[PDB]
């Protein structure tokens, strides 16, 4: 090439290949479920977060339709089918303070990256657990934040981070359930530390929104914490089953957010028949139905644990619907993964730097759409591919 630098991204894609870690998008057919056309073949997905199994759900598409039809097709950008959402997302996650205002984001990525810009800076300290979710870690570099990393859950630890820091402000940040191991962080522990050093509590709510809590409102519902030192950033495309995101907190914390993040975090809206639908979804997370979708993953998650100890590989104890399998190499990891797929399932395949070295696995991901019958299915796989490699 005469654009020399096209040579060397052919050449660094050929040792890619080599290596045989050249990764491939699926392209979907069908809407997101447990069954789905997938590159033109029908398989069972294990590779999404849709954990209460809305995003195909018929009351959703409805509400984007009429979403659509009330409020235009592009937001131009505040929609009232935004601030309506703001409310609805106050009422239904912010029961952790007296006073909560929401506000919504176009991504979970940038609710996290207004609210650490906001309310870190220079002279600010941030605690961050060490197995945060990358893009978390992101979003406190440009803060400009002094970072320190606490060992993962460990509150003795952080404790001793937190006294021999003398710094103004001090913001500790977790995931609430982390994502690659299915475990719950220490809400209360880590809570009581807030409280005790006058920090500010950041969790990223994720993976709990909709599937902890009662009514589905989250982690810090779940653990029935009331403090106006937590700021909570949740996802709508997840267990939602839409997309957007949102913080939710004390309303002066909320307002402080929107004088100080940077304009650009605000810009270009979500479509607002989105929102619309997120407020929907709200009402079938919050009724019979999503408690009766939650029961039902809760019994495949019980399944799933014991089907996952019954394989040869390293099971990560968990009692969420993530629930990893850890083969070690990427070799190893790949090839059970090909091995399923070769089955119609669809498990994605986790490498480093996603995970420590070493460590790569299977991340099963389950859904209230999924059925005894797939995860027998997932069973019989995992099984005669042991026996294969054995």
Same mark, same amino acid.
């Given at each position: 090439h005469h654009m020399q630098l096209l040579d060397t991204l052919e050449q660094g894609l050929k040792e890619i290949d080599a290596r045989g870690l050249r990764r491939r998008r699926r392209t979907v057919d069908s809407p997101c479920s447990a069954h789905m056309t997938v590159d *033109?073949? /029908?398989?069972?997905?294990?590779? &999404?977060?849709?954990?209460? *199994?809305l995003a195909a759900h018929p009351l959703l598409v409805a509400a984007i339709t009429e979403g659509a039809r009330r409020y235009g097709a592009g937001s131009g950008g505040h929609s009232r089918a935004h601030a309506q959402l703001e409310d609805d997302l106050a009422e239904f996650a912010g029961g952790f303070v007296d006073n909560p205002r929401a506000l919504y984001f176009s991504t979970g990525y940038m609710a996290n990256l207004a609210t650490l810009t906001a309310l870190a800076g220079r002279g600010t300290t941030l605690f961050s657990d060490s197995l945060n979710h990358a893009s978390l870690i992101d979003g406190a570099r440009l803060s400009r934040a002094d970072i320190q990393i606490y060992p993962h859950a460990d509150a003795e630890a952080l404790g001793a981070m937190l006294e021999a820091s003398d710094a103004a402000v001090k913001l500790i940040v977790s995931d609430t359930v982390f994502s690659m191991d299915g475990d719950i962080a220490p809400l209360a522990r880590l809570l009581e530390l807030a409280e005790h050093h006058g920090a500010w509590l950041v969790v990223d709510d994720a993976?709990?929104?909709? =599937? %902890?809590?009662?009514? *589905?409102?989250?982690?810090?519902?779940?653990?029935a914490l009331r403090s106006p030192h937590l700021i909570? =950033?949740?996802?709508?495309?997840?267990?939602?089953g839409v997309s957007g995101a949102f913080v939710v907190a004390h309303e002066t914390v909320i307002e402080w957010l929107v004088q100080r993040a940077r304009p650009y975090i605000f810009t270009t809206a979500s479509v607002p028949s989105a929102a619309h639908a997120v407020s929907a979804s709200l009402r079938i997370i919050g009724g019979d139905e999503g408690e009766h979708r939650r029961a039902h993953l809760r019994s495949l998650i019980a399944l799933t644990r014991d089907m996952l100890k019954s394989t040869p590989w390293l099971p990560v $104890? &968990?009692?969420?619907? =993530?629930? !990893? @399998?850890?083969?070690? &190499? /990427?070799?190893?990891? %790949?090839?059970?993964?090909? &091995? @399923? $797929?070769r089955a /119609?399932?669809? =498990? !994605?395949?986790?490498?480093? !730097?996603?995970? !420590?070295? *070493?460590?790569?696995?299977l991340r099963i991901?389950?859904?209230?759409?999924?059925?005894? /019958?797939?995860?027998?299915?997932l069973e019989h796989a995992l099984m005669k591919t042991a026996e294969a490699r054995a």
């Open positions: *033109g073949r /029908n398989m069972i997905g294990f590779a &999404s977060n849709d954990y209460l *199994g993976h709990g929104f909709g =599937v %902890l809590g009662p009514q *589905g409102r989250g982690a810090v519902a779940e653990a909570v =950033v949740g996802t709508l495309g997840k267990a939602a $104890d &968990s009692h969420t619907a =993530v629930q !990893p @399998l850890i083969i070690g &190499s /990427n070799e190893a990891t %790949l090839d059970v993964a090909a &091995s @399923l $797929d /119609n399932l669809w =498990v !994605p395949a986790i490498r480093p !730097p996603t995970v !420590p070295e *070493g460590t790569s696995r991901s389950l859904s209230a759409a999924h059925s005894h /019958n797939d995860l027998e299915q």
